[PDB]
Design a protein around this motif. Sequence first.
Motif, PDB file in Angstrom:
ATOM      1  N   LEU A 188      10.812   7.423 -18.341  1.00  0.00           N
ATOM      2  CA  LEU A 188       9.498   8.021 -18.083  1.00  0.00           C
ATOM      3  C   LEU A 188       9.127   9.084 -19.113  1.00  0.00           C
ATOM      4  O   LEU A 188       7.961   9.158 -19.524  1.00  0.00           O
ATOM      5  CB  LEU A 188       9.430   8.616 -16.668  1.00  0.00           C
ATOM      6  N   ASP A 189      10.078   9.933 -19.527  1.00  0.00           N
ATOM      7  CA  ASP A 189       9.739  11.009 -20.463  1.00  0.00           C
ATOM      8  C   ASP A 189       9.927  10.636 -21.941  1.00  0.00           C
ATOM      9  O   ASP A 189       9.562  11.443 -22.805  1.00  0.00           O
ATOM     10  CB  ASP A 189      10.552  12.296 -20.156  1.00  0.00           C
TER      11      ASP A 189
ATOM     12  N   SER B 375      13.949  19.242 -16.232  1.00  0.00           N
ATOM     13  CA  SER B 375      13.492  18.332 -15.176  1.00  0.00           C
ATOM     14  C   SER B 375      14.274  17.020 -15.233  1.00  0.00           C
ATOM     15  O   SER B 375      14.842  16.661 -16.266  1.00  0.00           O
ATOM     16  CB  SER B 375      11.981  18.047 -15.290  1.00  0.00           C
ATOM     17  N   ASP B 377      13.920  13.629 -15.638  1.00  0.00           N
ATOM     18  CA  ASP B 377      13.012  12.583 -16.166  1.00  0.00           C
ATOM     19  C   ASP B 377      11.625  12.619 -15.514  1.00  0.00           C
ATOM     20  O   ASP B 377      10.980  11.579 -15.355  1.00  0.00           O
ATOM     21  CB  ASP B 377      13.617  11.167 -16.051  1.00  0.00           C
ATOM     22  N   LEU B 378      11.125  13.817 -15.172  1.00  0.00           N
ATOM     23  CA  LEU B 378       9.783  13.950 -14.602  1.00  0.00           C
ATOM     24  C   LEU B 378       8.990  15.087 -15.244  1.00  0.00           C
ATOM     25  O   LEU B 378       8.015  15.562 -14.649  1.00  0.00           O
ATOM     26  CB  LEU B 378       9.849  14.140 -13.076  1.00  0.00           C
ATOM     27  N   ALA B 379       9.385  15.524 -16.449  1.00  0.00           N
ATOM     28  CA  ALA B 379       8.684  16.608 -17.146  1.00  0.00           C
ATOM     29  C   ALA B 379       7.173  16.366 -17.256  1.00  0.00           C
ATOM     30  O   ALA B 379       6.376  17.294 -17.071  1.00  0.00           O
ATOM     31  CB  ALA B 379       9.283  16.803 -18.543  1.00  0.00           C
ATOM     32  N   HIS B 380       6.756  15.128 -17.553  1.00  0.00           N
ATOM     33  CA  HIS B 380       5.338  14.838 -17.761  1.00  0.00           C
ATOM     34  C   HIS B 380       4.528  14.814 -16.466  1.00  0.00           C
ATOM     35  O   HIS B 380       3.295  14.763 -16.547  1.00  0.00           O
ATOM     36  CB  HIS B 380       5.148  13.497 -18.497  1.00  0.00           C
ATOM     37  N   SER B 381       5.170  14.841 -15.289  1.00  0.00           N
ATOM     38  CA  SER B 381       4.477  14.935 -13.999  1.00  0.00           C
ATOM     39  C   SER B 381       4.715  16.247 -13.262  1.00  0.00           C
ATOM     40  O   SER B 381       3.796  16.740 -12.592  1.00  0.00           O
ATOM     41  CB  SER B 381       4.881  13.778 -13.069  1.00  0.00           C
ATOM     42  N   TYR B 385       7.395  21.837 -18.962  1.00  0.00           N
ATOM     43  CA  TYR B 385       7.753  22.097 -20.361  1.00  0.00           C
ATOM     44  C   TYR B 385       7.363  23.511 -20.813  1.00  0.00           C
ATOM     45  O   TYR B 385       6.250  23.985 -20.552  1.00  0.00           O
ATOM     46  CB  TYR B 385       7.065  21.094 -21.294  1.00  0.00           C
ATOM     47  N   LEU B 391      13.604  19.771 -27.298  1.00  0.00           N
ATOM     48  CA  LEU B 391      14.724  19.528 -26.388  1.00  0.00           C
ATOM     49  C   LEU B 391      16.021  20.132 -26.930  1.00  0.00           C
ATOM     50  O   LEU B 391      16.241  20.192 -28.141  1.00  0.00           O
ATOM     51  CB  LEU B 391      14.922  18.020 -26.155  1.00  0.00           C
ATOM     52  N   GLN B 403      16.534  17.723 -20.862  1.00  0.00           N
ATOM     53  CA  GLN B 403      16.343  16.424 -20.199  1.00  0.00           C
ATOM     54  C   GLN B 403      17.624  16.054 -19.443  1.00  0.00           C
ATOM     55  O   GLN B 403      18.615  15.634 -20.048  1.00  0.00           O
ATOM     56  CB  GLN B 403      15.960  15.348 -21.219  1.00  0.00           C
ATOM     57  N   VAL B 406      17.724  10.741 -14.934  1.00  0.00           N
ATOM     58  CA  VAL B 406      17.519  10.452 -13.507  1.00  0.00           C
ATOM     59  C   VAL B 406      18.769  10.836 -12.705  1.00  0.00           C
ATOM     60  O   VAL B 406      19.471   9.963 -12.172  1.00  0.00           O
ATOM     61  CB  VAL B 406      17.135   8.969 -13.270  1.00  0.00           C
TER      62      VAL B 406
END
Lengths: 658, 658
Positions: A188-189, B375, B377-381, B385, B391, B403, B406
């Motif tokens: 996802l990222d 986060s 694997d949900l940084a963009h939601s 950041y 990173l 990162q 999951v």
Amino acid sequence: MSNLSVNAIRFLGIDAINKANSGHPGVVMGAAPMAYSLFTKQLHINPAQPNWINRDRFILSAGHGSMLLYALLHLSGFEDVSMDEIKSFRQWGSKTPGHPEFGHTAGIDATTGPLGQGISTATGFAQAERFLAAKYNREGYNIFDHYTYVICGDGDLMEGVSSEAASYAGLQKLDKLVVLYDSNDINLDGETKDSFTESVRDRYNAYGWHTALVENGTDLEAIHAAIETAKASGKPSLIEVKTVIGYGSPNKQGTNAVHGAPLGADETASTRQALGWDYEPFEIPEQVYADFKEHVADRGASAYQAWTKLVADYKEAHPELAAEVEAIIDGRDPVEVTPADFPALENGFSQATRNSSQDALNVVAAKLPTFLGGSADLAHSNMTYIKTDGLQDDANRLNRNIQFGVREFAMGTILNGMALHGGLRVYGGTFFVFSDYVKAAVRLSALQGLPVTYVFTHDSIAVGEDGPTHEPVEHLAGLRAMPNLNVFRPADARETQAAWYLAVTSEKTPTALVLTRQNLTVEDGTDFDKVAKGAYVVYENAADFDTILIATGSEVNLAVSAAKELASQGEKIRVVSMPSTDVFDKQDAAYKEEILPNAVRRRVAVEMGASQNWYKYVGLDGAVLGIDTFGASAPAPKVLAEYGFTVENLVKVVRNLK
Amino acid sequence: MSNLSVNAIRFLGIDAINKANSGHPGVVMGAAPMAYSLFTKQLHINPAQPNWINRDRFILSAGHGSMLLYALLHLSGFEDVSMDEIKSFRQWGSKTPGHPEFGHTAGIDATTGPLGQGISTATGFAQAERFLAAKYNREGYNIFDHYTYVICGDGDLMEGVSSEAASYAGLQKLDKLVVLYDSNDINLDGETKDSFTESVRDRYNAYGWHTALVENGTDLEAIHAAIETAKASGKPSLIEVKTVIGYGSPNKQGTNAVHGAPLGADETASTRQALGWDYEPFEIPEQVYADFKEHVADRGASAYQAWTKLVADYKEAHPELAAEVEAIIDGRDPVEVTPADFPALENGFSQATRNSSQDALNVVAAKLPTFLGGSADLAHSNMTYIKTDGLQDDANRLNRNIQFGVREFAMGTILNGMALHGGLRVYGGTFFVFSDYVKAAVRLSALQGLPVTYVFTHDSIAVGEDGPTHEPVEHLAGLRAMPNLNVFRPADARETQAAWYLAVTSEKTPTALVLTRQNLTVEDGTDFDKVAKGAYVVYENAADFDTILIATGSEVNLAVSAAKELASQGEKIRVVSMPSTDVFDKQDAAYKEEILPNAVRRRVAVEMGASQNWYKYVGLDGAVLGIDTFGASAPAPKVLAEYGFTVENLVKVVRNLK
Ligand SMILES: Cc1ncc(C[n+]2csc(CCOP(=O)(O)OP(=O)(O)O)c2C)c(N)n1
Ligand SMILES: Cc1ncc(C[n+]2csc(CCOP(=O)(O)OP(=O)(O)O)c2C)c(N)n1
Ligand SMILES: [Mg+2]
Ligand SMILES: [Mg+2]
């Protein structure tokens, strides 16, 4: 029509996602070839009989690609997935919800979405097929005989629960489980170079699995050959398939930009041009329908007719097995458990409820031959053994005790898989404090309607010397708040008999049993039949009482003793036992007023746990004696005294309420 | 002597367990040689300065073996573990509880017991050392430079959380992490042949670790040669050491009968004879004490004194860094964040609180250089950041975004490890519905007193199209019942600035932040400074009101709108916003009466989640508008209306109250 059929899958997904303005296109475009190869060459399924007990099973662990599965079921002819339902993807009341749901859409075998649990729960599907086959098949009559298939992605193999499952499945040698891994180098990222660099196939070799690599994810003959090799390997299988996420999108393929957003009009027009698809949205040519009808529906329907003729001859050859197998095909238990199976107990009998639980579950196992379970390396303290059997494994398939190892989460998913298959009743045990490790699989029991029984022992600060990391406080509140879960905390050996009888006859609700380490005394006022009401009266010295005590589990003994003291001082009091808050809340409004009358507001609740949920019964003018800190390391009688659970202190709590 | 000293460790454990009639002797007798080698040859620790910040760190992941660690601390000369405290093992108020506890006993680095979490949390100890070394070390001045060591058992390597951490640590290349695995072929219910048959060292190679094998677990020179090799390998290490559980017990060694019960009087006498030990219980010869004084106590004090001189020279050579390092050695933050760092906001501004959360934490990162996070694997939601950085990894050690992949459970343990080390402030994010996957680590945050901040977004049925597996219901009640956890659910952007400010200044309490997908409106009556009281008034049209609405989060907007409508028809009403039930419950009794006066009993509570915890405030004569079923897959405006969350339905609920 192979290239034609493959692109029909891709564009049904893309267009349905554009019209809902919501969904996940990347995985549909990448995995369409390997899913088409599986449905047209491997699976035996019959769209006219979607619940056929001997069909091949399939689980989409990467549940966000739901539109891939909806397109395959529509093209194959399943009645619940019409073109009108494809155009209602993700809308209120449709058969095409955003993630797959069992029991809402005919043809779907398991509810998915939470990553890791799809591939894990498939282990239990495969184990359930092995047991039923060993019990009932005979020479010339393979009544139970089918495979279990799954498709997964990168997220599923990062989650810990699937490592637990694969370790257990390698030891168990479950050779009919076959997994396809969509390996597209994206999550996802971003790219997997910043998240997931291990060698996945070397790890699965160390567990005892079969592994293989397919370098070109669009080569249909390479995909078929690898699946054939996997089925001849004698081991559970993981096949890594290299694909391009968003295959065909000139500006966005191979990037995370196609993971979870619709493509939009400009990119969708560039994708049609690059793949040579000139059909308009929801226009599928007749060639493709005829391809799917020959190689999925007709093939599946022929295998179903031969199975029914086989079962008919089997009942004639073996009349002593016919009754049980007939029941299972009807969806019923082979034998009926009843209240008369449990012996009567004497007033004053002294027993800890972990031991009462072992007695009652051995009564059930002797009556019902399809009841089985296990523990997570705690059988010697949970007291979960069925005492007539040894351990179940590849060389001893009919034994009914399972050793899960120290794997609480995967244990939850495997029980769910055995309950989804059909035919069985199952249970599993651990310490109450470590229910946190399995909470997410308990939720999927409640969501899919499965009557799975969880056995949690060592329930309070009465644990003693092990200390705060091993002593529950907040856990009953957390479980009581979850929809469609029934939590039982019995007061003595008699209440424990009843809770097991309800757990094993439940239709569509899972059960959690909370049991003690220390001995308890059978009360004169408890009653097997009244536990099914959730709460009832166990002591009362005057019909014009003005004070009510409410209690559960090991605190019922404590509250009765305090009432007799208060009565000898001239008070008029009632004691209510409530083994399940969840079951009491569902009773008729007339019955609730009989147990807790509105005009009596002097109320006190007692329980060795968090106070939170007791204010709905005692109100603003009552009191609650609970625990709202962490525990302590010392012998149990001393810890109970320091935390306020004595008869003297309870008497004091009641007299100062006014 | 070595053999003399090694048996001193074993019999101190044996005798102390018999005196308490409770504990675990098997692992003490098997693991004493490797533990002795580590302490006398590898660890730099100072018994007179137990909290020295550049000491080597040590974690006992197999927590049931606590007597092994207490014996070691006693012979080394740590003041809290006297011989009287050894004679008080597992007794009320002692310094030697049944499992090790950080904070209670000086010299213990981490609380253990729940299996898997020890080896996992050690990953964060090592990551903390790496970040502070890159930031503050200069040529000639290696102020931060030390290793991280652990001992673990079979149970630790069956738990899913340890696979997640080892995969993550292999990508990160944390080359100063060293793990000793006590491989004794036995667990609680029996032999590993029935539970755990994988190839452990082959799996760890697949992650990128270095691995080795020691076949004779009592050969101290083979053990030492293996650790020196491991420290030079340039990778995180796992050394498999073969031992016999209960070594010395002629009738019980190598069986699960020594796992978790005292040897007892007969078999103890037989074990003293088998190993040639001629000393009465709690009698230790002088030569052993001088072996430990020379090789652990005096060696560590010499290393400490040299470090103090190096720091003084360093502060003279780099005066521009001296103030920040001074603060850290004192146990304080190197820069102070205040309320005047956050800008004022206009009434009426529209913003979702996940986006308000990104604005507030970037204010924090610009002021405090030791604030970092990530986060799963949900940084963009989640919107987590820090916008000035990339990173963090082995090539870019000073970036402050991580990162985790999951891997929710392992994320929690690495945060706890980074906070245990000292010097930093940390946070981490996922969807609120998957807090179930990390709940057992949150509990260790609260038990140990660690101010770790959890970021949970997408908080209700307002998620819409993704459906019931992604929509939280029961999750707020589960967390509010945990002792020592503050749960905040902010009403708008103004309330979100304040929650972040309190989260980052907490001294010994973790924080959970619960944040929205959809936009909310800044209210006229919310106030930055009043959030610290937990609940306060945001609307009131008359001082003689007779009705009170209580609401949180996105439901504050709804409640103020319903209130304005009631006012227009002649009613008199107050609205209370309660961003934290847990902090409100700690206020003075006079302030509780000011906010919720005893004489006003018409009360309605509003929140999109389970109803359980609101009865404590509304009593038996009020109402609560909540949710006690699972969610649905459809656009959010349609789902909210079907579940009753509209201005019109709330007005109706107030009017039907009597
Ligand atoms: C337990 C859990 N945590 C987080 C999520 C959110 N989520 C859904 S899909 C996804 C990305 C996983 O990527 P991958 O499986 O490689 O899918 P691809 O984009 O390759 O199809 C994430 C983080 C989830 N569904 N379940
Ligand atoms: C999460 C969790 N589940 C279960 C337990 C209970 N428990 C403690 S030790 C143990 C057996 C594990 O044996 P092993 O780690 O091989 O230790 P040994 O007997 O060799 O010392 C179990 C199940 C626990 N402490 N934590
Ligand atoms: Mg992927
Ligand atoms: Mg072991």
